[PDB]
Enzyme design. Structure first.
Site, PDB file in Angstrom:
ATOM      1  CD  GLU A 114     123.818  46.734 -74.570  1.00  0.00           C
ATOM      2  OE1 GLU A 114     123.988  46.144 -75.940  1.00  0.00           O
ATOM      3  OE2 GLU A 114     124.733  47.629 -74.238  1.00  0.00           O
TER       4      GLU A 114
ATOM      5  CD  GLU B 254     129.163  47.991 -73.033  1.00  0.00           C
ATOM      6  OE1 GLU B 254     128.604  46.899 -72.285  1.00  0.00           O
ATOM      7  OE2 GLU B 254     128.505  48.522 -73.669  1.00  0.00           O
TER       8      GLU B 254
END
Lengths: 385, 74
Positions: A67, A185
Site C-alpha cells: 500500500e 490482499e
C-alpha cells in the site's frame, strides 16, 4: 509504537517449508521503505535475502512494498508512482541476475481506488508496468470497528465492490491492456476485521460474492486476508480451528473451475438473489468435462426457489448448501453442509464433503440468508469440454 | 412468488481465472510473533492449507515495509 523488526533465515525457511509442504506458491513482500539519501530504493537488504533464497534453491515470487499510497501517512515519506516503478525495475534486474529461474514480480499492492490512489497506480504502471507479471491491489468493504451484521447482509454494500473493480481495470486498460489484475490482499473489513462478525457464517456472503464478481469482471487471482493469524477475518484461528469461511473456501476450491460463464435472474433484480456460473472443477473426481457449477447467495429473509433454464432443467443436480449451526444464528462460528456440521475428522484428515443429490427437474431451494453450490451433472456444455 | 427463473450464457467463457484463483495471505505481522516457527509447523494447519492447493500464499501486509532481514540472527 515502532513497527520495525528483524527476521531470520529460520523464519524464511519456515515460511517456505510451510508453503511447499502444503502445495502453495509463496509470494514474499520486500521492504520498499529502505531508501537512499537520493530518494531511491536501497536494495542492499533485499540482495542479502535473494542471495540466501537462491543459495537454498527456493522458488519464490516477489513483491515490493505494501500500500504505497499510504507511505506518507504511515511512514512520513512520499514515494511517487514513477519512483516506485523505477524501484521495481531495479528489483527486476536483481531477479534476472539471480539463480532463480523465472521468478515472478507483482505490484504495486495499492489500496482500493480513491482519487489519488488511482493516479499512483497509473504513474506506477507507466514507469514500471513492463516488469510486473500481474497488477496487485487491495480491497475491503467496511471499517471493522463499526461494521454491523446488517452491513454484512446488505446488497448495497456488496455492490460497492463493482465500482472499485471497474476503476482499477480502467486504469490498467489505459496503460497496459491485458496485463493480468489480481486482488493481492482482500477481506470483509479493514482494521483486523469486524469482531464477532468477520469470523462467522455471516462473513461468507461478502467472501463468496467477491469471488463471483471478481471472476465475472476479469480478476484472475483473489488473495484472502488471512489464511491464519490473529485478525478476526482469519480462515483458521490460532487454535488451528477453521472458521465457516474456511469450509466455504474449501468447497469453492473443489467445485468451481477456471472457465467463468454467466448466470442471471430473469426479470426484477433486487440484488438479494445473486448467482454465478463456472464450469465444474475438472480436478474433482466426482464430475466430468461439461458439468457446470452454479453458486448462489440468498440475502432475502425467506426461501427462494431457483428454476434452471432448459436444457439443464431436467439434469441431475448435486447440492452443497451451507447453513449456520447453533444458537448464534448468522453469527455462528460453526457451519453445516446439507445438515451435517463440518469438522476435521482428526488433525490430518479433512471430512468428506458429501453432495445431496436432488430430484431431477426440481427447483433449487435456497433458504433465507444462505449460500450454496449446485453441480449440474451431465450438462454436456461444449464450452466446458 | 418465490420461484425465480435463471438465464444461463454458456456458449463460451467470459473469462479464464487462474487454477489458483482462490488464494490466501499470511500477514507480515505474524513474523513478529515469537511462536512463528512453532505455529507454522502445526500438522493441522498444514492439513487445512493443503485443502486450498493449488493457491498462492502471499506473505505481506503493513509490516512488509517495517521488516528487515538479519542474516546473522539465530
Amino acid at each position: 509504537k515502532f513497527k520495525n523488526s528483524t527476521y531470520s533465515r529460520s523464519s524464511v525457511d519456515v515460511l517456505y517449508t510451510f508453503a511447499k509442504c502444503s502445495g502453495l506458491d509463496l509470494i514474499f513482500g520486500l521492504n520498499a521503505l529502505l531508501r537512499t539519501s537520493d530518494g531511491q530504493w536501497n536494495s542492499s537488504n533485499a540482495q542479502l535475502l535473494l542471495d540466501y533464497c537462491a543459495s537454498k534453491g527456493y522458488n519464490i515470487d516477489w513483491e515490493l512494498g505494501n500500500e504505497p499510497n499510504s507511505f506518507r501517512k504511515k511512514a512520513g515519506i512520499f514515494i511517487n508512482g514513477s519512483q516506485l516503478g523505477k524501484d521495481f525495475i531495479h528489483l527486476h534486474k536483481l531477479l534476472r541476475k539471480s539463480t532463480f529461474k523465472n521468478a515472478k514480480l507483482y505490484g504495486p499492492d495499492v489500496g482500493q481506488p480513491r482519487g489519488k490512489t488511482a493516479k499512483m497506480l497509473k504513474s506506477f504502471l507507466k514507469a514500471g508496468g513492463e516488469v510486473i507479471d500481474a497488477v496487485t491491489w487491495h480491497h475491503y468493504y467496511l471499517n471493522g470497528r463499526t461494521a454491523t451484521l446488517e452491513d454484512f447482509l446488505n446488497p448495497d454494500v456488496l455492490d460497492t465492490f463493482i465500482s472499485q473493480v471497474q476503476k482499477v481495470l480502467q486504469v490498467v486498460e489505459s496503460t497496459r491492456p491485458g496485463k493480468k489484475v489480481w486482488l493481492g490482499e482482500t477481506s470483509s473489513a479493514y482494521g483486523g476485521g469486524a469482531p464477532g462478525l468477520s469470523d462467522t457464517f455471516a462473513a461468507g456472503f461478502m467472501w463468496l460474492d467477491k469471488l463471483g464478481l471478481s471472476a465475472r469482471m476479469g480478476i484472475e487471482v483473489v488473495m484472502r486476508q488471512v489464511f491464519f493469524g490473529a485478525g478476526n477475518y482469519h480462515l483458521v484461528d490460532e487454535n488451528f480451528d477453521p472458521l465457516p469461511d474456511y469450509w466455504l473456501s474449501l468447497l469453492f476450491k473443489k467445485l468451481v473451475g477456471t472457465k467463468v460463464l454467466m448466470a442471471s435472474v430473469q426479470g426484477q433484480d433486487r440484488r438479494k438473489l445473486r448467482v454465478y456460473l463456472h464450469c465444474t472443477n475438472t480436478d474433482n473426481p466426482r464430475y466430468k468435462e461439461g458439468d457446470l457449477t452454479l453458486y448462489a447467495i440468498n440475502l432475502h429473509n425467506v426461501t427462494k426457489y431457483l428454476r434452471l433454464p432448459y436444457p439443464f432443467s431436467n439434469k441431475q443436480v448435486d447440492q452443497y448448501l451451507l447453513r449456520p449451526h447453533g444458537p448464534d444464528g448468522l453469527l455462528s462460528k460453526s457451519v453445516q453442509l446439507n445438515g451435517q456440521t463440518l469438522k476435521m475428522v482428526d488433525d490430518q484428515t479433512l471430512p468428506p464433503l458429501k453432495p445431496k443429490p436432488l430430484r431431477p427437474g426440481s427447483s433449487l431451494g435456497l433458504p433465507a440468508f444462505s449460500y450454496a453450490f449446485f453441480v449440474i451433472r451431465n450438462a454436456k456444455v461444449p464450452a466446458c469440454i | 412468488q418465490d420461484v425465480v427463473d435463471l438465464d444461463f450464457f454458456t456458449q463460451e467463457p467470459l473469462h479464464l481465472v487462474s487454477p489458483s484463483f482462490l488464494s490466501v495471505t499470511i500477514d507480515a505481522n505474524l513474523a513478529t510473533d515469537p511462536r512463528f516457527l512453532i505455529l507454522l509447523g502445526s500438522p493441522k494447519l498444514r492439513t487445512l492449507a493443503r485443502g486450498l492447493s493449488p493457491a498462492y500464499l502471499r506473505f505481506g501486509g503493513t509490516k512488509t515495509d517495517f521488516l528487515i532481514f538479519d542474516p546473522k540472527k539465530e
